[PDB]
């Protein structure tokens, strides 16, 4: 069995569960004559790549409690009588073998919000999860952990002090958090001396944590196919298909490494702005000032504009998210504004990262009246991305790369100098810049 060493990285979040289950049962004499009991429920939210079933078994095996997993959509049936007692018999089963962990997963179809009022079996399973957990027994034996991929779709009336009222955050593992992940999965079937594990962690940028655990089992299949080395992990890196680049595929995929750029007088400036806070984090805290956030390129189109977008992302250890110009702006009314909303919180959850904005003139018009060049005149999509740059939130390490053709429609509202830092202009390449670009191709 495995306990408290299954994943590295996010272990202060697992230590919060360690002081929630084990610490009551290790010293129960400290929790009598203290008054108020600890809470009895944790809602673990985040991307559903990690699964959370591998962390909940690490906690339950260390304390010795029972692990009785109940899947999400299996308690819902179309006969409408056993759906409210398949969950009720689970807590009746976990009452005998105290202590025990229930660990209900995928709370989207089960226990939804009653704002829609659609379906009688969906409105009663909220109340069945309601009506028992208030009278659920104390002293930390029938505790429940929740695994849900969206924390804003469950019922807000569910959380009254005792159902799920200890919120914890699980996001994308950062640098020096994915290194301890591959240390666990390579404890058996040891790699040779040629492959380095620290260079392996620089290749993974924004992976879900369980994807690089399956990357080790994929690269080990290449060694039995050869009959593990550095080239076996390199071939399994491109075939892993992470969630950041899963939704878009353009055949065939290209990954370049022999591009450094012939524009060297701005390459040291681009290393100064977005590459120095992600390499030297402690110096910006000892000076007490925020680092550089964004930059904008403008000039002639096709003159190394997209080449600067991919040469920077290959040199930084962060992932690359690219918008396709006027492709996220649909004719439908509402989700055209939401297409800016879902690409920035994904960038903030994958901090640090670099986003690329291209052909700014087709979306902005810079305020222009209530009139439009095509006729839609939707001034709310420019005000939405006006709010997503600074916001009222934590200052993340997100970087934005602006690219446009003509600086006439440049928007003076997107240009406050805290938003974009440098208004640099790219010229046509000269004769000395042309010799540095022919040998690189």
């Amino acid at each position: 069995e495995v306990g408290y060493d299954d994943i590295g990285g996010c272990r202060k979040q697992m230590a919060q569960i360690r002081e929630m289950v084990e610490l009551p049962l290790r010293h129960p004499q400290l929790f009598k004559a203290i008054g108020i009991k600890p809470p009895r429920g944790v809602l673990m939210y985040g991307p559903p790549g990690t699964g959370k079933t591998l962390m909940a078994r690490a906690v339950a095996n260390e304390t010795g409690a029972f692990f009785f997993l109940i899947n999400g959509p299996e308690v819902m049936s179309k006969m409408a009588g056993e759906s409210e007692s398949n969950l009720r018999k689970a807590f009746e089963e976990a009452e005998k073998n105290a202590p025990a962990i229930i660990f209900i997963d995928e709370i989207d179809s089960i226990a939804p919000k009653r704002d829609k009022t659609n379906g009688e079996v969906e409105r009663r399973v909220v109340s069945q999860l309601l009506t028992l957990m208030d009278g659920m027994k104390a002293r930390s034996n029938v505790v429940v952990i929740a695994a849900t991929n969206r924390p804003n779709s469950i019922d807000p009336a569910l959380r009254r002090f005792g159902r799920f009222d200890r919120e914890v955050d699980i996001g994308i593992p950062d640098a020096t958090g994915r290194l301890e992940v591959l240390r666990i999965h390579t404890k058996n079937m040891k790699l040779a001396d040629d492959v380095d594990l620290e260079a392996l962690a620089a290749e993974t940028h924004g992976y879900v944590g369980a994807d690089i655990a399956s990357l080790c089992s994929e690269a080990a299949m290449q060694q039995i196919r050869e009959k593990v080395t550095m080239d076996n992990f390199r071939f399994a890196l491109g075939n892993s298909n992470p969630s950041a680049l899963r939704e878009t595929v353009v055949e065939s995929v290209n990954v370049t490494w022999d591009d450094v750029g012939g524009l060297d007088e701005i390459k040291e400036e681009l290393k100064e702005t977005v590459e120095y806070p992600v390499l030297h984090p402690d110096q910006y805290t000892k000076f007490g000032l925020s680092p550089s956030k964004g930059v904008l390129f403008y000039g002639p189109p096709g003159t190394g504009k997209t080449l600067l977008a991919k040469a920077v992302a290959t040199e930084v250890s962060a992932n690359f998210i690219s918008v396709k110009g006027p492709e996220l702006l649909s004719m439908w009314y509402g989700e055209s504004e939401s297409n800016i909303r879902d690409i920035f919180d994904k960038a903030r959850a994958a901090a640090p990262t670099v986003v690329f904005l291209d052909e700014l003139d087709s979306i902005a018009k810079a305020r222009g009246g209530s009139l439009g060049d095509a006729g839609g005149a939707s001034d709310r999509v420019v005000n939405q991305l006006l709010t997503e740059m600074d916001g009222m939130n934590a200052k993340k390490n997100v970087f934005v790369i602006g690219a446009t053709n003509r600086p006439d429609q440049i928007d003076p509202a997107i240009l406050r100098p805290g938003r974009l830092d440098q208004l640099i202009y790219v010229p046509l390449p000269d004769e000395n810049a042309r010799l540095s670009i022919l040998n690189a191709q």
Partner: protein, 426 residues
Amino acid sequence: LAVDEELEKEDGPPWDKEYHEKNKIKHISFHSYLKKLPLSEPDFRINKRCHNGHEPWPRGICSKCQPSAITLQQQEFRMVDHVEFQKSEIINEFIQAWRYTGMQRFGYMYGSYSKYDNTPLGIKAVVEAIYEPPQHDEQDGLTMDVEQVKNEMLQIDRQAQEMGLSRIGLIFTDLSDAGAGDGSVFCKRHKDSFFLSSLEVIMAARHQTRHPNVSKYSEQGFFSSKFVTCVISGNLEGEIDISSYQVSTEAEALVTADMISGSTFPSMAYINDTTDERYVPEIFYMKSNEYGITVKENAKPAFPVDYLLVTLTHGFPNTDTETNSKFVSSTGFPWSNRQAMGQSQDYQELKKYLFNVASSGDFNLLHEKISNFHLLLYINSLQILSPDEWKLLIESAVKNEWEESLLKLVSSAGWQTLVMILQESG
């Protein structure tokens, strides 16, 4: 018990309903009931935790924690399927106590269990001997003192574990002789009348709650106790044939202690009320309407007993061949508590029965005169001999290859002083 683990290895599916109706089998077995299912004894008591905020004791029983209406169905399985005897004279000795005084008797059965091969994954119950407790007996029935006999059956059960014996059943007689010169008995228990009296179901069901059956697939270590109930009543036409039944484990492990009492009718029993001591649910059962069929006709004051008993088959071993019998020496010795009859004796009966037969003659007939059940309980209750000599007396009586164990028995100083104190006494 080694019988429970031997049937777990063999698979025999054995729980087929269409196969057992072909061979005229009512209920399948206990071990094939296990493999189809998670062995939980159904509880009818009130709860004291209740998983909510209401108080447990005064009122406040919610519908998720309430004993529902019992449909009162028969048990679909049996613990044992066939009880087997070992000698026709042990039954003939027990009915001989009725022939001398006319009134009824009572007794406990000693034996073991083994494999039954007619039924798939069935258990057969082999009895070995009959013990008789002290009793006071009338012509209609009998009920002895509770406490003073339970004190007596601790030490004789301590006296029975060295041979490999255990209390497995009980017997009670009900003859009702007609005229004693033109027939044996009447026909008291048949299809029209009662099969088992409700005053004896509470004595049968209480013996199972105190004799638990060890099961590893349960949650408390005990489930579906293995205790047979035998009765000597009589068949239809002219004989005194015996019958053997068992109580249901779904109710009689729980309901007998609180809400089961004896009524005035022999075919029914009186339902009790707790008046806020515990909760007693409603009992549903069926009957036949005069013109059609009814559905749910009676709530409170009626429930039959015959929904609650399962049937068993008795048997006697063949005369030409048998495996072992282990206890045939005379089967005519005076028993323990036949004080109403004349067979309640002292040192005079040892002069008349054996006197260590033909004192210096032989040992082959002596082995067939000392392996009696009530003989070894009597000479150990005198406790003249040493306890290590009494262990040797066990292997010299019920164990095979007794010849080298018998000569080392009589050559000791323990056996010499018994025949010296017997010749001087009467």
